[PDB]
Design a protein around this ligand. Structure first.
Ligand SMILES: O=S(=O)(O)OC[C@H]1O[C@@](COS(=O)(=O)O)(O[C@H]2O[C@H](COS(=O)(=O)O)[C@@H](OS(=O)(=O)O)[C@H](OS(=O)(=O)O)[C@H]2OS(=O)(=O)O)[C@@H](OS(=O)(=O)O)[C@@H]1OS(=O)(=O)O
Ligand SMILES: *[C@@H]1O[C@H](CO)[C@@H](O)[C@H](O)[C@H]1NC(C)=O
Ligand SMILES: [Cl-]
Length: 356
């Protein structure tokens, strides 16, 4: 009705982890030449035993077999102007995450591999099918994503731009919006042994992950690191300087997933001093990485994801909402209103508009 409708890919050799077809949800808005393609997140798995666990626990993130027919767009995917002040009338696309690979996998599997990891190919296939359903008429394609989909934007936004240029669609301005996908490859609070997905230190997870997935990173970033050191390009502050497409970075300064991989678990128990200082330092490192990111929005809150959350309009930095900052960034790209909005206060909830 006003919901997005599911389409499984016509090419059924591009699959989710378990061999079922990948897909996308679409809501067309034929009065608009703006396209929002959203990449879903939800961790990853970097070896067979952890991928077998995720397949029993979270099969939705590995298979299309039970995806619903439609879904309602929320936050920046909402078609309601009250919920989505600047992009409500856009063509809306939600790409479910079923590849467990941070949108990096680019091969068909072997019969000898259990799982297929195809996220980068999924994105390319979605883009091609959208051409026949109106993307051919587009002037802007914003590739947005949360969490692993946020890092997936960083890995894929230039490939999507180069794909469309190569296909003969030079009018389409390709831009990225990376939400909660800007992580530090820092040391853990207390070092674990990488036996579970969530608790494996971030460097090691990606080091293992890129090999297990045969993941691909952007060439301009890859060229800056030694062979075998491609895992570097999964980290925002490393891949970002190489990106040609404009990219806006939304990142909580004390992101829950970042604390989780750093082996910190805040249950509402009293926060002791050692931990207190680790958390403070994390916020400061994260703010440092955003110093030369002119288009960014980074509140001092302990949270995770934002852009498809209904209450995304509630948070402010220096009296500027995120939708308003994204509108300023668009305005700034139209010519060829702050956009750098990073909290400087030192602890979760020092910003009074933080979600609860
Ligand atoms: O309903 S929409 O999704 O289409 O949003 C329309 C607004 O987008 C602008 C761009 O402004 S900005 O992103 O805030 O910087 O213009 C874009 O769309 C219009 C046509 O839409 S409209 O509803 O008839 O106004 C295009 O104008 S035109 O080509 O018909 O002349 C713009 O194309 S162009 O690059 O100027 O040629 C198009 O810009 S863009 O491709 O998105 O970068 C606003 O218009 S603007 O004033 O020219 O900058 C529209 O403003 S509105 O408040 O939603 O009406
Ligand atoms: C389908 O995708 C597979 C896997 O990427 C690719 O090898 C093949 O060429 C594609 N076939 C068609 C007909 O699009
Ligand atoms: Cl159809």
């Amino acid at each position: 009705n006003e919901d997005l409708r599911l389409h499984l890919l016509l090419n059924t050799s591009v699959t989710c982890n378990d061999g079922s077809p990948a897909g996308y949800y679409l809501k067309e808005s034929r009065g608009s030449r703006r396209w929002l393609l959203f990449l879903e997140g939800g961790w990853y798995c970097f070896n067979r035993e952890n991928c077998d666990s995720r397949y029993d626990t979270m099969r939705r993130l590995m298979s299309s077999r039970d995806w619903p027919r439609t879904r309602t767009g929320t936050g920046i995917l909402s078609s309601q102007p009250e919920e989505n002040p600047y992009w409500w009338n856009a063509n809306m696309v939600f790409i479910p995450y079923c590849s467990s690979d941070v949108w990096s996998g680019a091969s068909s599997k072997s019969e000898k591999n259990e799982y297929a990891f195809m996220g980068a190919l999924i994105i390319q296939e979605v883009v091609r099918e959208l051409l026949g359903r109106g993307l051919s008429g587009a002037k802007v394609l914003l590739l947005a994503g949360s969490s692993a989909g946020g890092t997936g934007v960083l890995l894929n936004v230039d490939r999507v731009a180069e794909q469309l240029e190569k296909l003969g669609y030079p009018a389409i301005q390709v831009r990225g919006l990376a939400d909660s996908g800007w992580f530090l490859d820092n040391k853990q609070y207390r070092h674990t042994d990488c036996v579970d997905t969530i608790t494996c230190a971030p460097t090691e997870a990606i080091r293992r992950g890129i090999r297990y997935w045969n993941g691909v990173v952007p060439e301009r970033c890859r060229r800056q690191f030694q062979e075998g050191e491609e895992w570097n390009c999964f980290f925002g502050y490393k891949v970002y300087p190489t990106l040609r497409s404009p990219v806006f970075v939304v990142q909580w300064l004390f992101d829950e997933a970042q604390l989780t991989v750093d082996n910190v678990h805040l249950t509402g128990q009293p926060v002791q001093e050692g931990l207190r200082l680790y958390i403070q330092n994390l916020g400061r490192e994260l703010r440092h990485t955003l110093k030369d990111v002119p288009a960014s929005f980074a509140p001092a809150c302990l949270s995770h994801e934002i852009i498809i959350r209904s209450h995304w309009t509630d948070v402010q930095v220096k009296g500027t909402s995120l939708p308003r900052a994204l509108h300023c960034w668009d305005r700034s790209l139209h010519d060829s209103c702050p956009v750098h909005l990073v909290d400087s206060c030192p602890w979760p909830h020092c910003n009074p508009s933080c979600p609860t």
